[PDB]
Design a binder for this molecule. Structure first.
Ligand SMILES: [Zn+2]
Lengths: 42, 52
């Protein structure tokens, strides 16, 4: 899963050539946080 | 600033030795920074140039 910049739309394109977003001419992809259980210390 | 640069130069006549060449420059027109992508000419922002 990779949310793109300048528009709210996930891509999930884990390919060796796909680097841009669908229906959007920009090529900046932010990795989306997956809801996993991590722990910290207070 | 660009007109004083492109207007203070004098192009010499291209004479190798009839048929000769003489080129000149006119008005200076600077466009806006765009993105030449595959879809169209998108808007180009200063953080797009910083991230890419
Ligand atoms: Zn996009």
């Amino acid at each position: 899963t990779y949310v793109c910049g300048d528009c709210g739309q996930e891509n999930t394109l884990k390919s060796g050539d796909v680097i841009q977003c669908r229906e959007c001419g920009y090529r900046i992809l932010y990795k989306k946080r997956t809801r996993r259980v991590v722990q910290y210390e207070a | 600033g660009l007109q004083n640069v492109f207007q203070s130069f004098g192009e010499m006549l291209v004479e190798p030795s009839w048929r000769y060449a003489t080129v000149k420059f006119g008005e200076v027109t600077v466009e806006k920074p765009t993105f030449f992508s595959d879809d169209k000419e998108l808007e180009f922002l200063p953080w797009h140039a910083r991230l890419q």
